[PDB]
């Protein structure tokens, strides 16, 4: 269970993969499990939860730039394998579920 950075150039010394936890905090703060910095990202920006029963749910924080498969999202939404997430300006990721 991981997030693929779709903008990582394989030919560069760039991080491609972020593994998710059961409860994953995403944002710019040191406290976040996946720490992303850049335009349009909040200290606390998003939350991904993996349910006991294998279900993946994304919960945006208020007032955040958040799209799933190209459309904006402002309440909890279930993710599937291969779903594309945009956070902020250009934090563009793809979801791999096992």
């Amino acid at each position: 269970c991981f997030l693929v950075n779709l903008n990582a150039d394989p030919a560069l010394n760039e991080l491609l993969v972020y593994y998710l936890k059961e409860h994953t905090l995403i944002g710019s703060a040191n406290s976040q499990d996946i720490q992303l910095c850049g335009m349009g990202i909040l200290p606390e920006h998003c939350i991904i939860d993996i349910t006991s029963e294998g279900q993946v749910m994304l919960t945006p924080q208020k007032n955040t730039r958040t799209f799933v498969n190209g459309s904006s999202v402002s309440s909890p939404i279930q993710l599937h394998h291969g779903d594309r997430i945009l956070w902020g300006n250009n934090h563009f990721f793809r979801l791999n579920l096992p």
Partner: protein, 364 residues
């Protein structure tokens, strides 16, 4: 009026006279459709712009409070001055003011278009006032544009920043790698917004048809305005190209050729699940939606020319395409989709083939 005594209560009543007046304004010429997307029977209003708009468009108008304040025609209370503004304005008035100088090649969205198109149309008109002051139209009117776009790597699927140049002088779109990497004749280009497929709100599909093979390119810009400017620059370039390549042809005849949206797209089984695109007469299928090239293609000619679509099998639902040579069998998940697909194929069948379409058929 009031009540008798120290309390002296004011009573308003059920009059709703102002709402009533605004409602009648909906009956006036030009107000029958949403000012912005054309949807019938608008039930919202911007009282600072003096337009009548649909629910969806009103939500976009709400994102631009400095320009537009919106009220429901029925569900909101109105002030007299607000009703008066609407009475002295309306959708026709707004066309002359805000749609005064819209270039003929400029894409006007419909209700089914993606959010980006609808939002940028509203923003261009009212916020930027792009069609009041023609200077503002330079990004897509100069016949030349360059800039970086995030493009999907052909096989590897990563979107990386690459330079693009659209030049009407040379009649081409090109891009450069990390001399151009590719040069694509405008004759052979199409562009279509595909935010769901690409998984990005600003996702634009550019296709390039060379030697009966279509290359899919997928790009986006971080800025919604910039990507819509690219789109309309592409349309400008096609338009200018078509005016010179086909003089004697009216602008009206040329404008629907500028860029084409797909009739229908989706997974069907063929039994293997594949992503299908109906681009006119040309049914393509892919392993993944974002593949650069189709796995295969099926041409759909006319009834005349020996083509028919059938329901059922000779997934639950079935469609059969009978070609002069072979039969093609497809499985649809649902009956809505089956209906839509069949409708798409029927549109090809019901229409007489052109000389170029015979050339395409000959290949397949």
């Amino acid at each position: 009026h009031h009540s008798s005594g120290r309390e002296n209560l004011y009573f308003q009543g059920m009059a709703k006279e102002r709402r009533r007046a605004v409602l009648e304004l909906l009956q006036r010429p030009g107000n029958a459709r949403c000012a912005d997307c054309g949807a019938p029977d608008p039930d919202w209003a911007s009282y600072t712009l003096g337009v009548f708009i649909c629910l969806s468009c009103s939500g976009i108008h709400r994102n631009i409070p400095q320009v537009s304040k919106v009220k429901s025609v029925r569900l909101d209370a109105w002030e007299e001055a607000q009703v008066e503004f609407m009475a002295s304005h309306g959708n026709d008035a707004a066309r002359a003011r805000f749609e005064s100088k819209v270039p003929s090649f400029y894409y006007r969205p419909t209700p089914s278009d993606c959010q980006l198109l609808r939002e940028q149309w509203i923003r261009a008109k009212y916020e930027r006032q792009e069609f009041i002051y023609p200077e503002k139209q330079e990004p897509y009117s100069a016949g030349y544009r360059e800039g970086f776009l995030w493009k999907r790597g052909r096989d590897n699927g990563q979107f990386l920043s690459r330079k693009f140049v659209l030049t009407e002088r040379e009649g081409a779109l090109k891009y450069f790698n990390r001399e151009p990497k590719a040069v694509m004749k405008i004759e052979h280009l199409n562009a279509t917004f595909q935010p769901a497929k690409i998984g990005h709100p600003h996702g634009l599909q550019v296709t390039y048809l060379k030697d009966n093979s279509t290359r899919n390119i997928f790009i986006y810009h971080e800025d919604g305005k910039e990507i819509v400017d690219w789109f309309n620059a592409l349309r400008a370039a096609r338009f200018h190209y078509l005016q010179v390549a086909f003089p004697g042809a009216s602008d009206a005849d040329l404008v629907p050729k500028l860029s084409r949206n797909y009739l229908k797209e989706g997974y069907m089984e063929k039994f293997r699940k594949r992503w299908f695109t109906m681009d006119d007469r040309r049914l393509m299928y892919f392993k993944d939606p974002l593949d650069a090239f189709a796995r295969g293609e099926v041409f759909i000619g006319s009834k005349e020319s020996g083509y028919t679509v059938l329901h059922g099998f000779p997934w639950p639902h079935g469609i059969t395409i009978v070609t002069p040579d072979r039969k093609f069998l497809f499985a649809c998940e649902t009956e809505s989709d089956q209906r839509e697909w069949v409708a798409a194929f029927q549109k090809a069948v019901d229409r007489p083939m052109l000389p170029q379409e015979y050339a395409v058929e000959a290949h397949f």
